[PDB]
Amino acid sequence: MAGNDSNLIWLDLEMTGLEPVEDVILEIAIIITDSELNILAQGPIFAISQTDDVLDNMNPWCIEHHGKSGLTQRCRDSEVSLAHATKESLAFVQEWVPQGKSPMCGNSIGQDRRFINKYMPDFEDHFHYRNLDVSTIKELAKRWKPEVLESVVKTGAHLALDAIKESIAELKVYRELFFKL
Amino acid sequence: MAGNDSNLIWLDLEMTGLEPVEDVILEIAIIITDSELNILAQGPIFAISQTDDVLDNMNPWCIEHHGKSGLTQRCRDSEVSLAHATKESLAFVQEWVPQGKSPMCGNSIGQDRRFINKYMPDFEDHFHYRNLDVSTIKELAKRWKPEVLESVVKTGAHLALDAIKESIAELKVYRELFFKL
């Protein structure tokens, strides 16, 4: 099933803040599912090597939340450059889905896409221009059928890996309870 | 009914191309709906003043399509500035939904957002950070229930209200046929 036109690239980034103009990427994880949301593969996980003054002067939210998740320390200890993570990610994703076919999948994935466009345009090129944004459906559920949100489970932050598994599980809940089979 | 929390702000833009690094906005159109997708208001439509330096040197797709469309000439005839379009759009929108409540709605509305974020920062501030991307559901339809696309009405009209009302209507189809409400 490695090359199916309908497979999906799921990803989550962690950043030093919200604005691509000043902020940089700290973490990347990728999961490939088939079109039915079965998990076909996990990409490597990269904490991105960043200097201490970058890590120390990020967003208050980020100091707290990345400090808590253990990401900050993992970037202190990493030798991984963004340049390397971009090559590996692109090669992995190429191994699984044809160029141009899969939209970018995840929660508020357009935010991530801003960072990928600016900092990893080679990687972005493998994707379709479309976004599969799980938060779109959450917003429709909030207004159309909010009790569905009760079945949605949100665990605590560790890896970007975990945040992706949450997005998939969330969409899986919607498929079962919110969309018509 | 004015200023209700679940009211939804819809928009489409037309541009000189795909890369807002140095591409610009040709047209702005905005529709408000309640949470049921009932159209509550049409917003000021704005073709944006661009010199022939800009209009002559758009992409091939844009020269040919914005030419038959009538928009290129409208931007040449147009007196309204970027700031005036920003100031007005913000005002209209401010009437109909409280601040931070509404995601930004439309097809691939993240692309639009990149242009709104750079050239109209004040306007984007009124939205929730979330996107409501109908094309997310179109991507799911294609994979889960393609028969549903048959009822979607895609003319191919690349204008202002043209493509908006088509995004709103496309969501209405999904609501009847694709969602379990």
Author numbering:
A (entry chain A), B (entry chain C): 1 to 181
What did the publication describing this PDB structure actually write?
Therefore, oligoribonucleases (ORN), RNases targeted toward short oligonucleotides, are needed for the complete digestion of short oligonucleotides into mononucleotides. Among these, ORN belongs to the DEDD superfamily, comprising 3′-5′ exonucleases that require a divalent cation for activity. Our research group have focused on the mechanism of action of oligoribonuclease (CpsORN) from the psychrophilic gram-negative bacterium Colwellia psychrerythraea strain 34H, to understand how the enzyme hydrolyses small nucleic acids. Structural analysis results show that CpsORN is a stable dimer and its active site is formed by swapping residues from the other subunit.
In the two linked uridine (U-U)-bound structure, sufficient electron density was observed for only two uridine molecules, although five linked uridine (5′-U(-3)-U(-2)-U(-1)-U(1)-U(2)-3′) was used for crystallisation. Even though a partial electron density of the third uridine was observed, the intensity of electron density was significantly weak. This means that CpsORN tightly grabs only the last two nucleotides of the 5-mer RNA. Meanwhile, the rest of the 5-mer RNA are located outside the binding pocket, in a flexible state. For this RNA-bound structure determination, D163A inactive mutant CpsORN protein was used, as mentioned in the pNP-TMP-bound structure. The last two ribonucleotides make hydrophobic stacking interactions with Leu18, Trp61, and Tyr129 residues. A more detailed examination revealed that the indole ring of Trp61 forms a hydrophobic interaction with the base of nucleotide U2, forming a barrier at the end of the bound RNA substrate. The side chain of Leu18 is located between the bases of nucleotides U1 and U2 of the bound substrate. The phenyl ring of Tyr129 forms a hydrophobic interaction with the base of nucleotide U1. All these interacting residues act as a wedge that may allow CpsORN to cleave the exact position of RNA substrate and guide the 3′-terminal exo-RNA cutting.
